[PDB]
Design a protein around this ligand. Structure first.
Ligand SMILES: Nc1ncnc2c1ncn2[C@@H]1O[C@H](CSCC[C@H](N)C(=O)O)[C@@H](O)[C@H]1O
Length: 187
């Protein structure tokens, strides 16, 4: 892949909600930890890097990260891990939260520079359907699914990994085209 033109940072914040640590087995934590690393990698070489957050960060995920990266995570730029929930962290900007979920009635068509998009930091193979839709609804924040299913058909394999969703959002900032973004992340 070659990226075209000068890097211009984006104002979009992207949150990896890491509040589902207790729902995962150790292999799922390790898989997720590596998915977190890919998000940063995708962000680091993005044409429009976002401010990346990791909320409710701690527990086994944190331990696994330090064990694999041996401190490297501290040197990461546009990276903000915090023990705070995204609700605490963005108390003032609550109306700007959008929780991405495959279970949403809404569909995301365009990313707004003023908005804060949340990705549920969980590997569950979609075993916990509605987990994220339910959490967000009950908090009173908006949800939206990705406008795939003009792209993927049969059937409910429309549920992507954490880094795939991030990689797709990032490329959308680059290409402003959904299908292209899908084509490079999901070939
Ligand atoms: N098609 C899609 N549209 C929007 N967000 C999606 C998506 N597929 C995955 N995601 C995001 O990636 C995360 C990991 S997939 C985990 C699915 C989990 N059962 C849930 O209830 O959300 C999800 O929390 C969701 O934020």
């Amino acid at each position: 892949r070659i990226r075209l033109g000068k890097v211009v940072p984006s104002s979009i914040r992207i949150v990896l909600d890491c509040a589902f640590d207790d729902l995962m087995n150790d292999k799922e934590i390790n898989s997720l930890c590596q998915q977190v690393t890919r998000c940063h990698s995708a962000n680091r070489t993005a044409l429009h890097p976002v401010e990346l957050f990791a909320t409710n960060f701690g527990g086994r995920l944190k331990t696994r990260q330090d064990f694999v990266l041996k401190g490297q995570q501290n040197n990461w730029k546009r990276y903000n891990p915090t023990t705070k929930s995204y609700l605490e962290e963005f108390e003032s900007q609550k109306e700007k939260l959008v929780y991405l979920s495959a279970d949403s009635d809404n569909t995301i068509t365009e990313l707004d520079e003023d908005k804060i998009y949340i990705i549920g930091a969980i590997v569950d193979k979609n075993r916990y359907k509605n987990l994220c839709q339910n959490k967000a609804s009950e908090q009173g924040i908006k949800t939206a699914k990705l406008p795939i299913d003009e792209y993927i058909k049969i059937t409910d394999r429309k549920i992507l990994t954490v880094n795939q969703v991030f990689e797709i959002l990032s490329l959308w900032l680059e290409y402003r085209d959904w299908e292209k973004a899908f084509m490079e992340v999901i070939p």
